[PDB]
Design an enzyme around this catalytic site. Structure first.
Site, mmCIF file in Angstrom:
data_model
loop_
_atom_site.group_PDB
_atom_site.id
_atom_site.type_symbol
_atom_site.label_atom_id
_atom_site.label_comp_id
_atom_site.label_asym_id
_atom_site.label_seq_id
_atom_site.Cartn_x
_atom_site.Cartn_y
_atom_site.Cartn_z
ATOM 1 N N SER D 145 0.843 -1.176 0.000
ATOM 2 C CA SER D 145 0.000 0.000 0.000
ATOM 3 C C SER D 145 0.885 1.234 0.000
ATOM 4 O O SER D 145 2.053 1.182 0.331
ATOM 5 C CB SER D 145 -0.849 -0.025 1.278
ATOM 6 O OG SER D 145 -1.624 1.152 1.425
ATOM 7 N N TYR D 158 -4.012 -1.250 9.652
ATOM 8 C CA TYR D 158 -3.769 -1.321 8.209
ATOM 9 C C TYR D 158 -2.336 -0.917 7.891
ATOM 10 O O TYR D 158 -1.609 -1.610 7.158
ATOM 11 C CB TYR D 158 -4.747 -0.417 7.455
ATOM 12 C CG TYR D 158 -4.785 -0.662 5.959
ATOM 13 C CD1 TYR D 158 -5.552 -1.696 5.437
ATOM 14 C CD2 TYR D 158 -4.060 0.139 5.081
ATOM 15 C CE1 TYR D 158 -5.595 -1.932 4.073
ATOM 16 C CE2 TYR D 158 -4.107 -0.095 3.712
ATOM 17 C CZ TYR D 158 -4.882 -1.121 3.229
ATOM 18 O OH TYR D 158 -4.957 -1.378 1.862
#
Ligand SMILES: NC(=O)c1ccc[n+]([C@@H]2O[C@H](COP(=O)([O-])OP(=O)(O)OC[C@H]3O[C@@H](n4cnc5c(N)ncnc54)[C@H](O)[C@@H]3O)[C@@H](O)[C@H]2O)c1
Lengths: 239, 247, 241, 253
Positions: D145, D158
């Site tokens: 990410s 996350y």
């Protein structure tokens, strides 16, 4: 006068895992700079306590498994009762498990992640709540690794947790800077504690090598550093 | 005791471009920590001189275009006379040129690269020799940037030079660690200086600190990197950016 | 159909430094994928030309010192005249100079920086002007190094220049991506182009020119359209270790 | 001839989370390049099966909770039974939980870490064992990410998990590259999928992000087809342990 910026007189620092090696080095370093110390350990830190109290500082010695996140609130409540405030947190409690990645067990995953990243986040959260209540800001110092930058071998959960530490340090800075909170990390190199030709410094690192950088990151002298990881590695990452 | 590790009493620090802004701050900070300063500038650092001497520290004001690499040897000779040694170097003198990349001139390339990276390597070399001769190690602090990490726009030679600074910082540490020399860098965030004079508000909202950096923000970090408190930090760049890279 | 996205038929690639090793590999790979090739070299890339033309592709051989930035517009004009367009630039022409950092000469600084970063920026500018004129976007592939990430020893100007390549790649993407121009870099590892080093390469072998064919075709093609400003290591895991 | 190096004819790819968005894009791309597909999903991925089979490729649809590491071996055994071999793994199954960091619940920590990093490591391990048994190498593509590089806000688990993905990708390469196994990652930028749905509904926030994407557009599932085929193919054989950003220049800016 800039030297006053490093002075931690009247500060209270909570250091998890400081009975030996790196954490002991950092606890003693912060005490030498003026901090009273709250320790959280699974082994009684007698040698550390002796060395800290010998400097004329106080040591509150708490015994707990840092992986139990439900337990954190009380640890911090005790520290606040005993000293009135908590100013600095060093999340040094951690473990490593070595096993071929292809054979790596779920236990060797969970135990390491629970301590090295999960409890680091939740302890930081717990202490940040106290910083906010106090209203004077605070300092958090996480402990990263060369394995935050490189993969290593046979330690997938350690690499995962330490890479995660570097990342979550960024998020905590982003989100909590508004509360006057600095969150940074130290990445020790290869330290003589519980390769040599690839260290430009030509020597293993020692707990003593983390005293200066930890006081720096715990002090007003690093106020515009936030979310950053500082390698204390004798040039390992440079080579 | 650890607080003694930050004390630079008896040290001599050579800082380039310290008449104003960030360099002035680092010079003054190093002086408060115990250093005598050698300045190298294009204009007389009058304010800095007064503030350094006000602290009871000495200040040698040398005047030179840092881009002239043949003239570096002399500047270091002048410093070793008068002070007897040089223990710390801050490579802060630099410039920026803003022009659309597609139109960017050779002049705006050369001028920036000559000062921001070429002169930085050669001055580090010159001072490194002096360190080796003296035989008691030394400290070099280069000045990187957010544009060592990110690209930015309209400043190709600045991005190139500041990216190169982060890299040569690694090489110099690798090669000269054996001489007891620490070579590290500070990467300032968005600092309120001549270099950065509603576009402002969009940037400011992306600084977690919620304020521009100040010269004062580099005093602690520069003293730290100039001192024994950072001895096992080498070849590394430390962002002093109010959380910019974190966001 | 995605395999079509890697097909470079009809494309024209200008590659600097393709007479041997890595540059030769990249030119051949691009030719294999369908590109006609424009070479810029100090000497005739005779072997490369033979191999490219054997594939049924065209090769325009230009002879020049890439460090002379005043000469770039002409090199690009010649490429555009011959093929009608230029679509891809690979900035491979580079040198290295080894000498102790403490003794490092100004010549060994200037020579490396002029070619490895200054000429890379100005050639990229030159070609980007042509891409913008054409209006069909374009690709620039710069050549980074492990010394874009690590320091190395005895090669200050190489490390400087290659760290700079990684940075200027970011800035060029930032400004030109809006025109459909992709500026990316390949960072080769230790290439065959001793045991201590191999034992730190996870792949357990040196890289080859052929190892750069796929990555260069990828970054020259529609298949990498949303990659921009980025450096991809082709290093057998060196940076991972 | 280099274009042959991208051709995945005869290969078998196992993609977790390929009912929609990014995973669906990668599955279809791999299938277009010649792969038979094994899907692992929470529901039957009807649309993806339709598209993959229309290409003349086979789709084995498995329904399972990827967080259950005890069930991974059986998923791979089914794949191997069907096709004789598994050649490529894409660890795309993931979740996100948004909550102020100061309030962040243990549930929002555990659920995200369990899927986004723990299951990724153990599924990689499970498939790597099969690659070693086969002795013809293999490909693992993890999904990183922008939050592997930057902090973000309100998503501590996350950010932790995706930073950890980048790190374990390095270690997996270090150990397994010797077997001709390539473990790499794709870091999508700001992509127009369910994960940015709320963000894109806020006109002001949407523009603030878009204006910081040099490409001047959001990413789409189609933008991962080429990079995933590349990383799943012999064209990338000397790339290992590395994360490739597919971000329109986000990290460059
Ligand atoms: N936001 C920021 O301010 C920022 C961010 C990253 C890096 N930097 C870097 O920090 C350094 C200080 O810049 P600043 O912010 O104080 O603005 P500045 O322009 O005022 O500082 C530049 C300094 O270098 C001196 N200088 C310029 N040319 C010289 C030459 N040829 N020879 C000798 N000295 C010369 C100037 O007189 C001045 O003292 C520079 O290297 C700059 O690129 C600044």
């Amino acid at each position: 006068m800039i030297l006053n910026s490093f002075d931690l007189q009247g500060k209270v620092a909570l250091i998890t895992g400081c009975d030996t090696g790196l954490g002991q080095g950092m606890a003693i370093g912060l005490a030498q700079a003026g901090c009273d110390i709250v320790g959280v350990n699974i082994v009684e830190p007698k040698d550390t306590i002796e060395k800290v109290t010998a400097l004329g500082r106080r040591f509150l010695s708490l015994t707990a498994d840092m992986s139990n996140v439900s337990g954190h609130a009380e640890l911090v409540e005790k520290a606040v009762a005993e000293f009135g405030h908590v100013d600095i947190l060093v999340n040094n409690a951690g473990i490593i498990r070595r096993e071929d990645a292809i054979e790596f067990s779920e236990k060797n995953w969970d135990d390491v992640m629970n301590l090295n990243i999960k409890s680091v986040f939740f302890m930081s959260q717990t202490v940040a709540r106290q910083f906010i209540k106090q209203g004077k800001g605070g300092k958090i110092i996480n402990i990263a690794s060369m394995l935050s930058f490189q993969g290593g071998i046979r330690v997938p959960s350690y690499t995962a947790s330490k890479s995660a530490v570097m990342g979550v340090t960024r998020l905590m800075a982003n989100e909590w800077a508004k509360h006057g909170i600095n969150v940074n990390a130290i990445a020790p190199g290869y330290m003589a504690t519980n390769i040599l030709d690839r260290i430009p410094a030509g020597r293993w690192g020692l707990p003593q090598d983390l005293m200066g950088p930890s006081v720096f990151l715990a002090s007003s002298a690093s106020d515009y550093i936030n979310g950053y990881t500082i390698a204390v590695d004798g040039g390992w990452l440079a080579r």
